[PDB]
């Protein structure tokens, strides 16, 4: 669209929102018994979490706990995929919502 | 960023093996979900065959046969349309062929710890003409497949009539039900092997990221999520320095 426009903080916010969107699409696919659709969206969500983790400046102290959460989020999404566990998806959706809401406030108050 | 950049190269192998195992499990779950439908349709077909064997009302027989023929056509549709990434799973593309191995196609999965041990997997034809009473070899003789069911023949033949009597046609459905159940169970065993691979891959990645494998359970993750969320709020500049390091063309690609 018009991405080169977005600031670095706005780019990260876009990633959090996309991750949530793909998790919600995968939960819906599980309800509709669409395995291929569920798998495609959870891998999309996993790729976002891994991109966030691998773009952490690990000289910054905050990066340790954020990356530990990303590692759990990735592992939990893999388990939810192979187990068709919407409950697990709702769990990871809550974490990403936590990160998304705090991040959106952080770029504002800055 | 360089510390995180090489951590990508360390676990790139584990991530791609994890994606392959996820893909393989979802392929099998796709086949198992379709086989569950075929099994349920076969159960309904058996109900109609039994009802036809106990009906003395032949236009009742024709109406029952119309439903059966539509149901076996549903079975054909499932076997012909079930797909994963464009690969036909249940139409016999991947059936075993011991009579002519040159014509056999295999599904390949990677199994075991480290996901490097390849296995070959076959899936039998699940169409209506491939389910029923099998001969010594893989073949189904005439009038012995689910596609051959015709309960209107019950009006002119005793129940013990060979091939077309009620008892014989009921046997065709029973054998077909078990054939679908056997195919689903064999695919479940493969799924189990891929699950064990995923858990060994995760344990391998957990060891290589010590102090980033730190979160164990739901209680820790819940509590760490709230703690990290409040640290992001309280240290906005540190949060920007820590995470706002994506390049725009990578973001557009991930959001497709």
Author numbering:
A (entry chain E): 13 to 122
B (entry chain D): 46 to 102, 106 to 304
List passages from the publication reporting this PDB structure.
The most abundant flagellar building block is the flagellin protein that assembles in a helical pattern of more than 20,000 copies to form the extracellular filament.
Notably, residues 46 to 57 are kinked by 45° in the orthorhombic structure, while the helix is straight in the crystal structure derived from monoclinic crystals. Apart from this difference, both structure superimpose well with a r.m.s.d of 1.5 over 329 Cα-atoms. The crystal structure suggests that the flagellin/FliS complex forms a rather compact particle detectable also in solution by small angle X-ray scattering (SAXS). Contact area 1 involves the C-terminus of flagellin (D0-C) wrapped around the surface of FliS in an extended horseshoe like conformation with a mainly hydrophobic interaction area of 1600 Å (Contact area 1). Contact area 2 aligns FliS to the D1 core domain of flagellin, a region that was not present in previous crystal structures. Taken together, our crystal structure shows that the interaction between flagellin and FliS involves a complex interface at flagellin including the D1 and D0C domains.
